[model samples]
Target: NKPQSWEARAETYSLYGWTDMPSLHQRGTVVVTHGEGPYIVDVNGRRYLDANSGLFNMVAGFDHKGLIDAAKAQYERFPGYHAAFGKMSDQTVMLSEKLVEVSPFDSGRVFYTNSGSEANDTMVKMLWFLHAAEGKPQKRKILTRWNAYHGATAVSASMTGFPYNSVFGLPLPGFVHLTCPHYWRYGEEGETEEQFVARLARELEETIQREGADTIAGFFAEPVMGAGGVIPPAKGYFQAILPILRKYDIPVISDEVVCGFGRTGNTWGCVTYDFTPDAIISSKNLTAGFFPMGAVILGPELSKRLETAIEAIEEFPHGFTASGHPVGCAIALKAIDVVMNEGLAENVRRLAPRFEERLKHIAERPNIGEYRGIGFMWALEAVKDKASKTPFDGNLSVSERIANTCTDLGLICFPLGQSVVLCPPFILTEAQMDEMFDKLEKALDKVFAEVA
Candidate 1:
């Protein structure tokens, strides 16, 4: 068991970043060496249906032919190229064109980065640059919502509202988190969704006034909150807040890392939620997780301002070596085609209702306080007392137990805090979807009994 496997794997790399070392060593990490359709095969040859979809990407499948061919074709011609120094590969140009073309904005510009974190970091800097160039140096504050996840880079991490990451003294100066739009959990007792929205709107207005609108640069939000228990906004949430943001002239950014592509049953979560963001931070689905790439799509006003600011500064002193790798761009083009042209977007719509039905049905199961999501992204909140709506102690790790149980039952989903999240690939068949729900149902029943 050791010679060809564990030692070899350890010799190649060490675990870091968002990993649970004790648990990994205790349970033994699965050595995934290959994938087939919506399933992943461990080195031991065990096939498990991947409900998490490899970090919520892999929209088409684990082994989509179009993605492979596209990457191969690009690698053959030019394995690598940078989008810096006023030079870019043809694929980068083409991908940029396609991104703007598909975006809701009539005209815009695109910048590239390696991941969503980098894209977000770049956007933050771009905002500062635009403001600084316009002589509004006081416009530096950033407002985001608590429980929203942006990224892990310094600035992006600071923008992230999860307090867990703040243990190392994050969320540096100028970043503020407003109240989360969780109606069931965070809303006041007996408050209607409209009232909750109004409350948040008031908070935003008051926060801007407190911090001074002249000091605020942008308001960042995700169309559908991901990496924070798969939260969808309350009814009329985005629509109610748009006017407030506009009155303050804050640039609205839609973090499309998780909700981009067809994950939300639409081409983009912004369109699904009616957010007219001035910028879109896109990745993950940009290349369907086949190639790592992030995009910053800027609308006309922001684009022109940024372009002119860069010209005035004589150079845009920012970029990465592999910011816009030719292979990544080529893969992104194909991924967009795979998601849209090859009926995967339609597939998400077709599959969303069935998946939602399963999620809602599971909500009635033991200890499930809430089951909320849209399209393929969903969550089941593991509660302790249904009547009291009380949560289990954090030490219990109840969600992890259920997720581990699901793993044993030949399915893989994410255990996020008190919730078990599911965001399967868009290619899952109806029969396979049924299998997933059945397995999850059993896992929940077994785990709930044991844990209780």
Candidate 2:
């Protein structure tokens, strides 16, 4: 019998999430075997420059000796352990210290999970538990923004704003989604950005009043919406809504799973955007994709509240089996040092101007509606008419075609909605960046010519 092709083997047994099935069946999968720098080598030995940076993680690139070494040493020393029952590894303790030192709060606490989904889910349960313990069981509602991408688990997916969740019958009765803050698309035709911000603030106040402020538990936002097409919030957005949330005594969580650890040219996205959150949901870059780990970093206020709550109850009653695994913690400790001190963060700052210039120039294309994002993350929204900002008909699948063309051209970028998103690794060289843009431009032109 003949051996099955890689794509055939994959489709036979594997399942994918958030993938377009029709497109996958048509183009098949790029089964990767290994990676070097910012490139991935496929099973067929083809190399593709991964502009999406391995789903916007892998900031240190596909292989880094320092991170690998850290993991190796931990595996040899302790192999495995968990942070529970008052027992934990030294690496977990060290990582907590490092996380607190770098966090926005003067003193904070950290909780670990296996992924961002579980971390978000964990945070929601914490809020519910705290409220109930404090004799406010009705404070169980959650708030997020439309177009936000939180995670895949039941609770986190309900927090997501995509209408696709209707199939799962989610948003779960109490999860509220405010308007997305993408002024370019959501702002009224004649509304100024300042007016848009104020309008959103008013909407928040109204929502709180309408829903009963005492009923809401917390509000969550991504400093920059990643999977939602790399949308940066409208100017003064956080300044507008944060006050409302605070006024209602609701905690504000900054979901930095995407923008954390220098993706937005700062140590934290909240710092880059000049805001403080009650807590932070972090993953992705936490271990630089070297290991799977997520952390909930609680600010001083939440920390004290949770501490008192737990003290009264004598137990938090929630934890993952692999929470704060020794190997993952060790990798994260090294990854944090590498990003902040080894010039990776500095590189993002250095390349940002040129990255913007190239993207801005290409965004001048008539089919390209807008180019928006910050630091290393950016997206070009496609449209049928640039002046009117009319999106192409869904039948065209313009962004998907562009992405497939890019793949054929040996480039890997994210196709999100009608936009093409490019978030390159922090270790990408100037020459490699040029290559990424050149191939992307070629693909964009090719797709436009065919679709126009």
Candidate 3:
């Protein structure tokens, strides 16, 4: 155990993650100070299989030589630089080049930010700016799914579909949320998956009509909804919805904050779903957790419109101090290499079957209402009445208990509402996956026994 002095100091000094703050304070925090491979060691020297991948970013694991070296190299040469003020880092240029090189788009531009929240905010602002420049200043509404996650900033939080965001009185102005295409959870009772897609398509069209498509500026989506419980769309979900969005000339923005960089089994979530978007909001795995970096990439058409508008306006008015930090860019370049050149993407492909197998087996648990995901991402919904798919009451913290059990058994995962989420590092070995599954099985059994 760590010194009580340090533990108490931490409690006073830091707030925990999005949820579990009360328990986090009650039990004291678990201090993980270092990591090796796919495991992290707490202050007490207990190691855990990190199933959340450090919030689904640390794809190359806690440490990777290439990433460290890249950061070190940039720090030594030029650690500080800004994309604004007519100055920029070489690493920033290279990373942008590499991003477009790998992406399906032939030509585009990248704007860097410190996190996905800022990047998403940038996307919204850019759309508003371009629309205003084109004399369509009334276009301001941003369309997103009800179960989607965009970010946590004032503007971005409004775009985020999470209900808790509403507690803050945010999501200001014309942002409209359409139906989430989770057929199992939100699909109309007795509707087939195909019918569900049709209904959602209809809803999107009707929403645009009601809100006036002239006021609709953009439509955002995640290829695989991450914070929305790792949901993948029903069959033809996007195929059906995109046509209507295109019909109204709405700009499509793919929020790949969690799904980018092979996490969802592809370089980009847009590629995975075979839908082309005007722009992409990327983060999380941008540096494989080596550095905090976010980017907004604009496709050729949007890039042209933006450039023309910027020229007319004399300059674009937004950027951050650390927008193109050299260290972040350097690490992202190497991290991309590590994911691609070093076979990590293929590793996800090869190991996904085993991961799905474990998820399927976990779903068979009496309390698990469903398991859904793709690539390295997944979630298990803890239910109360499995026969009727009745969810456990939020106050029960059933998922948190299971998460805590796994923590004690030397595994780390996340409990999002009633769903236990997992997105382990891509570097995890065959044995390590089994180790994760094994520890989690025991943890589930231990927790289930107490409650059952």
Candidate 4:
């Protein structure tokens, strides 16, 4: 008989492929059979609110006809083409132009990749190449923030700040991690947010001094810490760091995989956070998860240097076979059109107040340590004592419990170490937002009863 449930399919797939299902029970599985609008129906036909938005992508929702039609049309016209060897597809060329137009920086070239991780990996190589072209070969080290998540490739995995990624024992050399800029967790007692930012900048300077800034090539950072517990930077954090980067002449690469494409209620989180990066690495919402596509947008100076490096090598040795897949490119073009023509960015801005208000109301609950986020992305830090701001013991698995509770209530969210993160689809309505929070509230109540 054909498989009737995801659990059965999971067992069969596990035999053939590796699956590290995030924040889920390895044994108890929910087979997703269909998605429509903001809802995902499991194999058993239970509908979920889809608050997590399929790992924080899926901006336009599960069944965007525009994206589907674009993919279909592109498949018919030109199913596949290589952008390698100076060759290009028309759709890929159009997507590149679109990215340059929408980018926060001046019009620049786009290097395509199939995933965010690959895009960041490309950035790493490009940074090294740029430094080499500048005749500073010693400047090969890259810095990232603690608790940040860039990707899972060899170099991108090294850029990740969480300890879980490091356990595999394949450390990428020449990568450094700095202190996270979470005011709630790391801010000193009696310190203002600005003071905290200043302190973090000092910490960055110290690291650079200790490591010899001449050896540093660039720093990679998320505009807002996403997988690192949805923590927004303290006030003046980016403002404080930009001057430091300028002083050292170290280039900054904004990894906008999570915060790009209007998640922050802005076209680019770099603008929202005041980050003047030399390059921007982005993916995920680039195609609203309708098609796999990612790109690295470089400033004019960096682009020229990269070109020089390519000329010196006589061959650009790095590129993915599906780097600029025509179908993906077309879908990305359509996705950008939808985001702009449909006012998705404006929708995020308009919904920010309501979402923040709901989060702040939840913060009043005794178990919530803090609430932080803007636009559609948010986080709730769980704690044992709200007055003392004491987090639960590491072994307590408070986040796991809350996540399970939310899942049981037909809402999907991610649990990062000690915080619960929510990144709802941009198209989610006020009623769905209410439903999401109602379920979350119930989950919190269950946690309260269980933990006490």
Candidate 5:
């Protein structure tokens, strides 16, 4: 007999390997079995439109034959190899070359890791190494934004401002947090986007002054601030911050882990928002979520410092066993090729307006507090009073309710705090977009009624 509740199945899965399952108290239980195109089928035979793109990384859709074929070919040729020990895989070399060609820098060098968290960890170490090479061992502080989500490792978790990451009692250190440039939530009353941007820059400068610029190594930021309420940066935000970093001679590490590879209708979030950084941390979409892989791309000056550091030490002692795995590298190369050749970035550009229009049409409903987004990323903030912009009681769990309602109505999305986030694949068609919104509206209606 089929299971009646996902909670029971989830408990069983938890016994095996499903830690971090969203609390059963809020979301109950739901298990997925398969996906095709823009939809996923649950084990109970219910199908739902996947609006979150499997945690915002499945840009190519659920099943892409090209990616499957590429992975299979790599496994057939060389199933296992490592980029450690100065040895390399053929796929790794090709992938590295492809990454360099498409990178924001003229000629980039790629350092592979298995995930964005690991990539950010690598960036932290590299920042320290760079400062050490410059004879500035005191410059060890890294600045990140409050509400930003970089990763969950020790150093990366420190960079992340979310409470749950550090709640396990292992507090992260050496990172300072600045205000997020989210105009809707943090903007002063009647403050224009440009004004808020300027104020945030001033705040960043003030923080640097308080901490002493000599002690700060670099500033890390997400161009659009993913996992921090799907917040897009305010106008002139990066423009103001970049000059300040230049004045302080602090390197900027752009975290493009979530916004990279057409998620923001551009090749890189840095390009989308005109952020020129000393280094970049990218992953997730590198292999279209088909395999575990990530990389760090360094600018010219930082590359020089890294080279000097390695030479000075006579050996670099940082690498993972699966770093630059042959199969992962091969999959990443194919994913990049698909994105470029198929013009996925352009696809996101084309579909963005329609998606916005659809969301805007429904945003006027009584349940929505605000609607904000760009490109394939968007969020609907639910509030108790639209005029006051007051959120529903946190204890009420409005966002989680809406998310569960959406699941019940045959749609899958991300409920982040009080916001319902949608990030469909780049390949999603206009009709699919409409279907997602229709289901979302229905889900919201159910949630609104229940809450009322």
Candidate 6:
């Protein structure tokens, strides 16, 4: 037999994830060798612009000298250290300070984990432990919203509101999910956006009343629902829900894994939404995607509460072996500087309007249902009938086919449900922005012509 291609070898030995198997089998994989700025190069040397930012992390692109230098220096110096015991690396301590400094909270504490999923899991455990220590042992119920993507750990998966969790029989008892704040999709026919917000607020209050406020531990949300096809909340969303959560004394956690560190043209998504969360679940952009690190940043109130509980218990009694790995922390520190000080965030703030303009223009097509997002993140939802907002047949796999076509055309876009998600790297230039939109429009045109 001839030597196997990278695609064949990958198919033989590797288990694919978050990939459409049928598409993979038919289309084969574009085995990648490396990345250049926002473009990734395949093993066969085809370069493709990555509009999805490698899962919406990789904000600094693939070859940032400063982040690479930070990692190199740390690996050469301290190598590795754990957050456990009474000792930790200097990088860990400094990164914690930087996190608090950059957080929306006036004061806070940080807990490290290897990934966003584990950080969310840590936050939940903190809530449960603190409530139990404070004599509210029954306050174990978690409240999220429909279509929110928290993480994929056993506990975090339970908190996620996706229907696929049903396959695992998840969202374990006491984890409650409310209506998504996506007014465009969930609002009643006769209702105005304001009315939709008011109705959601009422549902929250009623849910609290029925569930008993004291039984609920916390409410977790993403200011912008990223994985739910980039659905930005209705106007006045946080304004409407904050008061109700406060009335019930529920700690509101803003899951900013995809929006933190200037993905939304702000330091944090909660800041952009004009509300302060009791805690923030941060990952992804926290390190500009340079390193694998997630941190649960507790605001002053939760910090004090957790501190009191820990003081009483003598120890928190939970952590990962590489919770505060020094090399990761060092990379994160440099990543922060690169994002905030080195013009990445400014680039996002400056280019967002242009990004919106191009996508909004593309959305005018008859089969394109909507263009919705903020800052650098956005989505174009496909529909069978634009006027009726009817979705394309699922068996048609319209989105998967469109994404596959994009790959063939030398572009990388994320196919989520019936939408194509675009979250380009922070380093994109005006020319690159034009390039991105031009290719996307072409792909949309081709796909719509084929299916519509």
Error of 6 at 338 (Å): 0.2
Off by over 4 Å in 1: 1-4, 11-13
Better of 2 and 5 by TM-score: 2
Per-residue lDDT of candidate 2, residues 131-173 (tens digit) = 9888999999999999999999989999999989999888788
In model 2, which runs have C-alpha deviations exceeding 4 angstroms? Answer: 1-3
lDDT of 3 by residue, 88-116 (tens): 88888998999888877899999999999
Q: For candidate 6, lDDT tens digit of each residue in 282-334? A: 88987777778999999999999999999998999999999999988998999
Clash numbers, per candidate: 0, 0, 1, 0, 0, 0
Model 5 CA lDDT for position 423: 89
Local error of candidate 2 at residue 368 (angstroms): 0.7
In order, the Cα lDDT scores of the candidates are 0.89, 0.93, 0.88, 0.86, 0.85, 0.90
What residue runs in model 3 are displaced by over 4 Å at the alpha carbon?
1-4, 17-19
Q: Which stretches of candidate 5 lie above 4 Å from their native place?
A: 1-10, 13-28
Residue 30's lDDT in candidate 3: 73
> Highest lDDT: which candidate?
2
TM-score of 1: 0.97
Give the TM-score of each candidate: 0.97, 0.99, 0.97, 0.95, 0.95, 0.98
What's the best-to-worst order under lDDT? 2, 6, 1, 3, 4, 5
Q: Name the weakest run of 10 consecutive residues (lDDT summed) in model 2.
A: 1-10
